[PDB]
Amino acid sequence: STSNSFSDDWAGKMDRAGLGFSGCSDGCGGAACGCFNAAPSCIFWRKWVEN
Amino acid sequence: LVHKPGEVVVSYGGMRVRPKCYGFSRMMATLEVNPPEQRTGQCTGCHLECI
Amino acid sequence: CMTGAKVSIKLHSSKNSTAHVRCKGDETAFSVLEGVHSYTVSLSFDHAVVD
Numbered sequence A: 001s002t003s004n005s006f007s008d009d010w011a012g013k014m015d016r017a018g019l020g021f022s023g024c025s026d027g028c029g030g031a032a033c034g035c036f037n038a039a040p041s042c043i044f045w046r047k048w049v050e051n
Numbered sequence B: 001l002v003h004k005p006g007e008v009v010v011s012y013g014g015m016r017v018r019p020k021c022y023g024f025s026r027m028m029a030t031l032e033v034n035p036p037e038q039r040t041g042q043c044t045g046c047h048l049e050c051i
Numbered sequence C: 001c002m003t004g005a006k007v008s009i010k011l012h013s014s015k016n017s018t019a020h021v022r023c024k025g026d027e028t029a030f031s032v033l034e035g036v037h038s039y040t041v042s043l044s045f046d047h048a049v050v051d
């Protein structure tokens, strides 16, 4: 059930960010993908709105 | 080999940049202050006529 | 004709006298005062129904 997709690095802890949804997806592996293991990579994403 | 995810590269506006240090911290700054104070309250010179 | 056709023009501004009227058929320049006042100038026309 872990939905807190904030590894002490995201910019969600701001006053101008607003509302959003902490989501996540999957990634690929290889030299072109960034790692050196044949396994899916954890790729987190965060979207919001601005004015 | 040391235990670390390796070097990090950030893309901003379609261009990939290799910074020296990457971190999120606080910093003292200022804000924009607009003191209009009734710029144009009420002022007009007109007249009335009958036809 | 000799005296021409007089046209009354009303303006309103903060500057003392900064105006330059330019139109086809005839050009007329005059001076104004500060605030809203009434001024009468004459131009040269070549048509009975001036529209």
Ligand SMILES: *[C@@H]1O[C@H](CO)[C@@H](O)[C@H](O)[C@H]1NC(C)=O
Pocket (backbone or CB within 6 Å): C016, C034
């Ligand atoms: C505008 O006219 C007033 C009164 O005639 C005068 O006191 C003032 O100095 C004038 N200002 C300018 C910029 O000519």
